[PDB]
Amino acid sequence: GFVFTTVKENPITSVKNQNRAGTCWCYSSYSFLESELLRMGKGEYDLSEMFTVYNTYLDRADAAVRTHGDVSFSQGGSFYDALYGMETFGLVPEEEMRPGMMYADTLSNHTELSALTDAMVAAIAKGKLRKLQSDENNAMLWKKAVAAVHQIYLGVPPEKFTYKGKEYTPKSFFESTGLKASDYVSLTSYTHHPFYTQFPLEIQDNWRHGMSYNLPLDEFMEVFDNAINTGYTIAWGSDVSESGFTRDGVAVMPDDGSDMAHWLKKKLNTKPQPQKWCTQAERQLAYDNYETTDDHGMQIYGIAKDQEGNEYYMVKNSWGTNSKYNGIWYASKAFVRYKTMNIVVHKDALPKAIKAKLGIK
Amino acid sequence: EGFVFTTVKENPITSVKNQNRAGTCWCYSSYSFLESELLRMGKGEYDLSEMFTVYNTYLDRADAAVRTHGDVSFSQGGSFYDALYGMETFGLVPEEEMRPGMMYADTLSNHTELSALTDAMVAAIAKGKLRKLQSDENNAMLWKKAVAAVHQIYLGVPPEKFTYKGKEYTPKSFFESTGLKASDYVSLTSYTHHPFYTQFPLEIQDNWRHGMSYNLPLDEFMEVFDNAINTGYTIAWGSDVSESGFTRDGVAVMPDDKKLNTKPQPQKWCTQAERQLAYDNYETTDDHGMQIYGIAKDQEGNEYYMVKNSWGTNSKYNGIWYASKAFVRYKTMNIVVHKDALPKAIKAKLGIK
Amino acid sequence: EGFVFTTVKENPITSVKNQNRAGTCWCYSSYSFLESELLRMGKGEYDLSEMFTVYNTYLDRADAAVRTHGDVSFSQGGSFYDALYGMETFGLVPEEEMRPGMMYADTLSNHTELSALTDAMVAAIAKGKLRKLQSDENNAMLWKKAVAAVHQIYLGVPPEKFTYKGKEYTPKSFFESTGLKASDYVSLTSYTHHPFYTQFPLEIQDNWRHGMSYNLPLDEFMEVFDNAINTGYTIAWGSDVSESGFTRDGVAVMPGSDMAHWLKTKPQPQKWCTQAERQLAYDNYETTDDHGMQIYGIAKDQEGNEYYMVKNSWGTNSKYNGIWYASKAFVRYKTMNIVVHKDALPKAIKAKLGIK
Amino acid sequence: EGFVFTTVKENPITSVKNQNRAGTCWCYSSYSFLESELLRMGKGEYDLSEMFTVYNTYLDRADAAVRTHGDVSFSQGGSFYDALYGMETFGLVPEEEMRPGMMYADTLSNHTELSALTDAMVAAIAKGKLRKLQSDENNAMLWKKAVAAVHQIYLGVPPEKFTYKGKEYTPKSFFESTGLKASDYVSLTSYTHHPFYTQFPLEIQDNWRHGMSYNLPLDEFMEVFDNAINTGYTIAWGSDVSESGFTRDGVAVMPGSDMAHWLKKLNTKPQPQKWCTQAERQLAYDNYETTDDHGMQIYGIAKDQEGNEYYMVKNSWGTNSKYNGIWYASKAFVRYKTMNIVVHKDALPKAIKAKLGIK
Amino acid sequence: EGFVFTTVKENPITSVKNQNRAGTCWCYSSYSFLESELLRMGKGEYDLSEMFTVYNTYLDRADAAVRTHGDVSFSQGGSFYDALYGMETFGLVPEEEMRPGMMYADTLSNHTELSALTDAMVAAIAKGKLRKLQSDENNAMLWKKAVAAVHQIYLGVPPEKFTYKGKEYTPKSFFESTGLKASDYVSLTSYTHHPFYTQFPLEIQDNWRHGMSYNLPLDEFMEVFDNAINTGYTIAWGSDVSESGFTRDGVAVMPDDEKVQELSGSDMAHWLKLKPEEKKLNTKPQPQKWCTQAERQLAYDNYETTDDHGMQIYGIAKDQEGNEYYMVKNSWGTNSKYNGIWYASKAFVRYKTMNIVVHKDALPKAIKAKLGIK
Ligand SMILES: [Cl-]
Ligand SMILES: [Cl-]
Ligand SMILES: [Cl-]
Ligand SMILES: [Cl-]
Ligand SMILES: [Cl-]
Ligand SMILES: [Cl-]
Ligand SMILES: [Cl-]
Ligand SMILES: [Cl-]
Ligand SMILES: [Cl-]
Ligand SMILES: [K+]
Ligand SMILES: [K+]
Ligand SMILES: [K+]
Ligand SMILES: [K+]
Ligand SMILES: [K+]
Ligand SMILES: [K+]
Ligand SMILES: [K+]
Ligand SMILES: [K+]
Ligand SMILES: [Zn+2]
Ligand SMILES: [Zn+2]
Ligand SMILES: [Zn+2]
Ligand SMILES: [Zn+2]
Ligand SMILES: [Zn+2]
C-alpha cells in the first residue's frame, strides 16, 4: 500500500464535517482562515460556517432574481464568498449558529431547505411576475420570505453576542480578528486568458465574478511549495471526480453510446505508481471539455512523501474523521497540477519574482 | 330598452366589499352572510377580517395537500364551510386588525406573488422526492413553519390579543362574543347522483375539508330560497357564473334561445336532469360565492334574486347583481342558510331537529 | 440461529391468494377478511371475486377524478371501505364468474397495460381542456362508457345473472344471501391530529371516498387487536410495509451528502413506540404506503416475544407459504388503520366510541 | 394638439439603420455611437459591419454558456461592452464586407431560424448529459466549430482580408486605422445597491462578460448627459423602453382578478412629468419594472412648444416613423428608465471625473 | 459442458469491423454483405467507407423528418435499403477516404455528441414553430446547409475525387467500377398481416424510406437462408437481438424453458428458485422452441420482436449434438469468444428475424417464381 512521511506541515484546526450539504467552500475557507489566525498569533478559533452560508445564500438568491435565473441558485460557492462575507456580514463563533440545531441534529442536512428555497427563487426569477411586491420602505417581500425560510432551517443570526467575556457584533468580532480580504489573492492557470492578468473563472459557483490572477503552470506550482515551505497554508479548489481520487484518502494521477453495450451489459490507485505529469495544453483540454469541472474546496497544509519518494500535498477535508487518515487526504503533486481549478493564499506566501510579475505590491 | 327592477323584499346587509386580485370570494361572501346574520340576531354591525380566516384556512389547505401527496390542490379558493369551521377553530377578528394589502403598501388584496411562492413550496413538499420531512425537538414540522412565515409576510401577523370598542379580546373570545354557532347553519344542494334527503360532500376541489351538504329535490330546494328571504334571512350562495348570461352589467339571466342578455326575455326553466347534466359535463363548475339578500321583479314581472357581490361598487348597481330565478335554479351549486330559514316540512324530511 | 414460531391462537381463514402484478391488495385482504367472517358466522367457505369489485371501484374512482378535475388521483389502490361500500352497492360474485388474467390468457393479474390506457384516458378528461363533456339522449356520459368498456376488455364482463351451487343469482341477490352488512364493521385508527374517540377520514390518497375511522389512543387501539383474535375474530390490517424490518422471508420486526456524491434474522429486543413517535412518522412521510393484509392469529417466538400472524396476498411461494409474522411492536408503530366486526371490540371501548 | 420640437443642440450622426428582426440593437447603437465618435475625431464617415461583431460576439456567448453549464443564457442581445471588447479583440470591418440578410436573399436581418438552431445546439452541450466534449488533435473543440459553421451559414463568412478605398486591410488593421480605443470609453450607471463612485458589473443577462460600470448619484449621472451633448459628444444609451410612455409615434414620456377572470391624452401632448427620486428609480430596477435594456444613441437636446426638455434619440428601426427613425425622450423618462450609458471620458465634467478617479 | 462448433459450410467474408459507439450496424452489415458479394463476383477484396454512406443517409433522414414535421424520427439507425439506395444515389468510396473517428483524434466512431447536436437541430426545424424556412437565391435551404456542415465537422468531408490503386475516381465512378446493382438484391420477410407472395414496406422506424420486402410463409423463408449459403451466397440479416438468448459469449439460442426443466434434476418447484448460472439455458446445447407462424406474428405485434440490429450470415455450423446454427459476422470488433463471430441457432433465426436481403440468384427457383421475380 502507501506509507507516508511528513516532510513539512503547518498548523491546522480540527477536522470538521459538512455532512449533507454542498458547503465545502465555506468549511475549507474557514479551515484556511483559522490556520491564518494561528499563523498571525491570534490563537485558535472555530468560526460559524452556518452564519456565512446563510448570508451568502441570500445574496445568491438576489443574484438569481436580478439575472432572471441565469445565476443558478444552489448550495455551492467560492473562497471569495467567504472573504467577501467576512468584510460585509462579519464573523461569528461556531456556538452562536451551529449546524443541525433547527431540526434536532448536530450536523447539516439541507436537502429540504434547498427543495423549498430553490422552488421559491425559481418562482420569482423564472416565473411570470411582472412587478415584485415591496413595503412602504421599498424593501422587497420576496427577500423577506427567503430570509425567513433560511432562518427556520439554519437559525437566527445574532445581532450581539458574548465571547470570552466580551460583547461583540458580527462586524466587531471580525474586526477583532485583524483579518483583511485584501491580504488574500486567488490564483489559477489557464490559457484562454493571457498570463499575468486577472479574470473571473467561468464556473457556476463564482456568481460574484471574483477575479483570479493567471499564472503559467510551473509558476503556479512554485506558489504551492513556497507557501507551505514558508509557513502558509492554501485554500485549494479542485475537481475530485476522478477514479484517482479515492475514499481511502489518496488522490493520484497514475500513468496508464455503444451499440454492443446497449444490447448486452491493475493496482492503479492502491500503491505508488509513476504519475502522468500534464502539460499546460492537457490541463486546458480537461477544463474546456468538462473533464475538470466540479470545484470541491479543501485546505492544503503540508507536503509528504510516500515510500518511493513521490511527493504529495497533505489535505484537510471536511467530511469528518471516519476515514483512513482521520479526515486527511494525500494528493500527489501530479494530481494537483492537473485537477486544481483555483487557490487562495496570503499575498506574502507568493515568491518575490512571481509577486512582481503579477504587479502585486 | 333595458331592465327596470322593483324590489319586492330585501333584508339588511353590510357594505359592499372588494376582494380585488385574489380568489377569496368564499370568505367575503361568507362574511357578508354572517354579518347579515349578526344584524338579524340583534348584535349590530360588524366588519370581520377576511384576511385572518384566509390565512388560517390556507395553512390547513397546505397541510391537506401535503398529507395527500398533492391530491388536495393548493389554491386560493375555499368554501362556506371553511369560514364556519374557521370561526369555531381559529376565532374571528375585526377588519382593522388584519387588513388586505397592508404588507405591500396597498389597501386591497393582490395575492399573485404569495401564491407563486406558496404553491411552489407546497408542491416541493407534497409532490417532490423528500422521503422524511424535518421536525424540531417538539415534533413540530419545519415546512409548516416556513409556509406560515411566508403567509405572514404577505398577509400580516394574526393578533393574539387586541382591543375592540374598549374591550380586550382574543380571536376565540371575540368569536364567542358574537354568539354565532356553526351548528346553526346547513349547506344544501340538489343533485341526483346521491339520494335525496341524505347528506354528501360535494365533489369539488375547494371542498377539500369534505364538508357535507343536504340534498333536496330541485323544487324543494328553490322553496328554501324564497322562504329564507320572505322570513327575514339571507343566503350564502355558491354558483357557477361562467355563462354568457352572467354579465358585467349586473344581471344574471337564463334566456330561452339578438338582445339575449340586455332586456327581459322568457327564461329556460330547467328540469332536475338538465341541471344534473350541466354538473356532470363541466358546464356548471366554478363555484363563485356571493350573498342573496332579496327578491326583485323586472318591468315584465319576471322574478330575480338580489345579490351582494364582492367586486367593489364600481358597477351599474353599485356592486349588486340581479340573478333570475331561472338562472339560480340551473347554476346554483350549493347554499348555506340558518336552520330556521328552512320551511318546517323540509326540515322534517331532512331530519333536522 | 433464526426464528421458531409457536401458535398461541389462530382463527379460520381461507386459502392464500395471489394479487400478482396489480396494487389490488386492498381488495384481496378485504375478501380474506370477509371470507373469515363468513366462516365465523356459519355460512361456510366462499371464494369471492376480487376482479368484480376492483372493476366497479375503478369506475367510481375515475368518476371521482373527473368530478374533482384531477385532485382525486386515479391509480390501482383502494381501501377496506371500497370493499364494504362495494358489496352493498354493486353486490358480490363468486371467483369463477370473473377471474384474474382471463382476458389475456393468464390466470393471475397483470394490470400494467390497463393502467397505462385508463390513466391516460382519465387524465385526458380530468386534467385536459374539454369544456363540455359529451352525453347521449338519456344524459349518460360517453367518457364513462369508454372507461367501462376498456376495463371490461382487460378485466372481463361482469355477470348480470349466474348460477352458483344450483341457484340463480344477481350480484345483489348473491350479496344478500351472504348475510354480510357493511354496518357491522368499523374502521379504527390511532393518531393525535384529531381528538380521540371521534371519527375522521384518514388523509391518504386511496381513501378518496373519504371513509371514516374511529380514533383511539394507542394502547386501547392495541387492546382491540388482542380482543379480536382472542374472541374468535380476524382483522383487516392496513399497514406501511416499506421498512427494512418488513422482509421477503416472512417476518416484520421493529428496525444529499457531498462525500457520498463523489464516492459510492433472529429475535431481538423491540422498540416500543410512544403515541408521539407514531405520529411523527405519519406526519413526516416515514409511514405512508398503506398495504392491506389480514391478521388472524397470535404467535410467539422461542424467546417469548409476541407476533401477529398475517395472511398476505402474494401467493404461497415463501418461507411460511404466504403467511407472515409481524411483531406487536411493528404493528403498533406502522399500522395505519384496521377494520373489525363491531363485536370484536371490548365493551368499554365500544362505549367510549358511542357504538351501540 | 400634439408635440412640436425645436432642436437646442445636436451633434453629427450617421444615417438611421434598421436592425429588423433580430435583438441586435446593442450593436447598431454601439456603432451609431462609434461612428459619431469618428466624425467628432476628424476621421470622417464610416459604416461599420454590425454582422461581423454580432457573429464573433455570439461565438463568445456560446462559449460562456457552455463553460457555465447553461447559467449564461444564450440569446440575441448584448451590451455596449461587447462592441468595445469586440473591436479590440476581433477588429472591425466595413458594412459591405458582411451585410445583413445576404445569406437568405434579403437585405435586412431575420435571425429567428438561426436562433432556433443555435439555441438548441448550445443547450444540447451546455445543459445536456455529455460528460466529455470532443476535440481534434490540436485540442480545438468540435462543438465550437459546429456553432461557428452554422453562424456563417446564416450571417456570412467573416473576411480575413479585404480592400477598402484602395487599401488592403485585415479586420485588426482596419480597426487600427480608425484610431478608436476601448480605454477612451467609460460605462456609467446610477443605483444604490452598490456604493457611489465605485465600479460594479450590472446584474443583467446581456452583461455576461461582466463589464464594469462606474456608479454615480442620479443628479451627477444626469449632469453627464447634458455636459456630453453640450460639449459635442454623443451617448450610447441603454434603457428600458417597455413602458406605455415609450411610443411607436417617436416620443418617450413619463407615465389575478376574480372579477376580470369571469368577465386622457397622457402620451400625445406635453404634460407635467414625474421627476423620480434615487429610491423610486431603485425600486423599479429591484422589482422588475425596469428590466429590458435596449440600446440607442442620444445625440442632442430639444424642447417642445411648452419648453419641456427632451433628449434626441437615434433608434435602429429604420426610417418609417414620424421623425424618420428619431425619437424624443423626456429628461424625466431618461432619468427613471436608463440602465447604463457609455461616453468618451472627455465628455465627463472635470469634477465628476475626479470623483471617479479617472485620470 | 459448453458449445463446440463445426463449420458445415461458410462463404468468404472480409475482416470483422467495429462500429463502436454509434448505431450504424445497418451500414457495417450492408457493407460486409456487399464486400462478400464482390468476392463472390470475382472483383476481389474491398473495404468500403461506412462513414460516407452514414453521412449521406443522415442528410436524407433529416430531410424526411422535416418534410413530415417530425413523424419520421431522426436517429442513428437505418436499413439495408439505405445502403443499396445510397450506392446508386451517392456512390461509394474506399475506407481510407473517410475513416471513423478522424475528426476527434480517434480511429473508431463515437457519435453521441454529433447526435446530441443534430437531433436538437432537426427537432428545432421539424417540431418547432418556424412558419417559413429560409432559403438562398437559388432556393437552396439554409437549414440543410447547417446540418450538412455539422455532420462534416464530426464525420469528415466527403471527397469529390480521389485516387485508388493508381486510378482517379468520383464516388459515382468508383461505384460503377464495382459492377454492383441495387436491382440485383431483394428484401424478404415473413408475416401474416399482409398476404403472402406480395410486397409491403415493413412498419419500423428505420425503414423511413418505405423500402419494400417480399413476404414469404415461414418455412419457405427459412428455405431461402439454406439455399443462399449452400450455393455460395451470404445474407444481410436484420434481427431482434434483445433476448436473454442472445449473449455476449457469441451464441444466439432459443431454448425451451419448460423442456430444459424436465430434463434437469430439478422438479418444477426446485427449478424456478435456482440461480440463472445453474439453469444452463444459454451456455450449452438445449432443446429449442420452434415457433409457428402465429407465434412469430404475435412477437412482432406485441413488441417482443422489435429492434432491428443488422448483421451478416455467411455460413452454417453444427454443435457437438448436431444442432444447426447460422454463422454470423457481427460488427462489434474481435474482442469476443469467437473473434467477432456469433452462432445463431436456426430456431432463434426463425423466430427473431425481421428481414433479410440476398442476391436474387440466391433464391430457389420455385420461390422466385411464386414471387414473380424474373
Ligand atoms: Cl464539490
Ligand atoms: Cl407541526
Ligand atoms: Cl370564482
Ligand atoms: Cl388468485
Ligand atoms: Cl402487500
Ligand atoms: Cl441596415
Ligand atoms: Cl477550441
Ligand atoms: Cl431599440
Ligand atoms: Cl431449415
Ligand atoms: K466552524
Ligand atoms: K472530472
Ligand atoms: K371584512
Ligand atoms: K359554466
Ligand atoms: K377470490
Ligand atoms: K452598419
Ligand atoms: K469499411
Ligand atoms: K426482443
Ligand atoms: Zn464539496
Ligand atoms: Zn369568485
Ligand atoms: Zn399492497
Ligand atoms: Zn432592442
Ligand atoms: Zn445494431
TrEMBL record, chain C:
Chain residues that bind Zn(2+): 25, 258, 291
Similarity field: Belongs to the peptidase C1 family.
Keyword Hydrolase: yes
Lineage, uppermost ranks: Bacteria, Pseudomonadati, Bacteroidota, Bacteroidia, Bacteroidales
Keywords from the UniProt entry: Aminopeptidase, Hydrolase, Metal-binding, Protease, Signal, Thiol protease, Zinc
The protein's name: Aminopeptidase
GO MF annotation, one: cysteine-type aminopeptidase activity
Matching Pfam families: Peptidase_C1_2
Annotated catalytic residues: 25, 291, 312
Cellular component GO terms, alphabetical: cytoplasm
Organism from which the protein derives: Parabacteroides distasonis (strain ATCC 8503 / DSM 20701 / CIP 104284 / JCM 5825 / NCTC 11152)
Record has Hydrolase as a keyword: yes
GO annotation terms (biological process): homocysteine catabolic process; proteolysis; response to toxic substance
From TrEMBL, chain E:
Pfam families registered for this protein in UniProt: Peptidase_C1_2
PROSITE patterns the record matches: THIOL_PROTEASE_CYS
Active-site annotation: 25, 309, 330
Iron as UniProt keyword: no
Family: Belongs to the peptidase C1 family.
PANTHER family according to UniProt: BLEOMYCIN HYDROLASE
Protein name according to UniProt: Aminopeptidase
Source organism (scientific name): Parabacteroides distasonis (strain ATCC 8503 / DSM 20701 / CIP 104284 / JCM 5825 / NCTC 11152)
Lineage: Bacteria, Pseudomonadati, Bacteroidota, Bacteroidia, Bacteroidales
